[PDB]
Amino acid sequence: VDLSKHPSGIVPTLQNIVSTVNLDCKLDLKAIALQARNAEYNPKRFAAVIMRIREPKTTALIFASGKMVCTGAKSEDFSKMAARKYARIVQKLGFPAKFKDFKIQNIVGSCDVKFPIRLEGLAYSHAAFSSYEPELFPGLIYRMKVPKIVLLIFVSGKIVITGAKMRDETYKAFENIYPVLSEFRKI
DNA sequence: GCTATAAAAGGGCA
DNA sequence: TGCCCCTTTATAGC
């Protein structure tokens, strides 16, 4: 375990990657929904072809403008491999799709500090960063400014870390919050 | 299943 | 302008 990059000794696990790419070419969404297989389309509910592949396990949102959203991957590279596979499926349907401006847009991670947390005390002493309303949602919402990352912190000690575009931002946010969480361990 | 969080995308609607 | 449509994923108490 690289304690130079993770002084806490804990490495958050990447759970979800959102990326975007531009095929540059215009698409016929209705025709794609007829020819492609694992593909749904209902334009009066949403203006995109929803397509899924098995490996990497992802879901694509494909728009008539040529833009594509890839969701569900476990790593930045699985997200790119998936986006290329969808773009290849689009190319085998008669469309001159390209792979322009691929970009990681969101990285979701999670981890466990292995001790309970007094969420109320954390919200009290960090009122400017925290939103905690247990009657609405059992997790405390921590809006970290540097880096700009949102953390969902639970009594169990599990944490959700979302909003990063580089994984180092996921790790840095967790390393910033870890000594704060230790200050609010529950008996 | 709701409740909450981030992000991208487009049509539809006050 | 602002928002939900819509997709993903962890987390957990209604």
From Swiss-Prot:
Cell location: Nucleus
Keyword tRNA-binding: no
Record keywords, A-Z: Acetylation, Activator, DNA-binding, Nucleus, Repeat, Transcription, Transcription regulation
Keyword Nucleus: yes
Alphabetized GO MF terms: DNA binding
Cellular component annotations (GO), alphabetically ordered: nucleus
PROSITE patterns: TFIID
Positions of Sequence repeats: 14-90, 104-181
Family note: Belongs to the TBP family.
Function, in words: General transcription factor that functions at the core of the DNA-binding multiprotein factor TFIID. Binding of TFIID to the TATA box is the initial transcriptional step of the pre-initiation complex (PIC), playing a role in the activation of eukaryotic genes transcribed by RNA polymerase II.
Binding partners and assembly: Belongs to the TFIID complex together with the TBP-associated factors (TAFs). Binds DNA as monomer. Interacts with TAF1 (via N-terminus). Interacts with MEE12/CCG1. Associates with PWP2 in the nucleus. Component of a nuclear protein complex containing at least TATA binding proteins (TBPs, e.g. TBP1 and TBP2) and ATX1.
Protein name in UniProt: TATA-box-binding protein 1
Organism field: Arabidopsis thaliana (Mouse-ear cress)
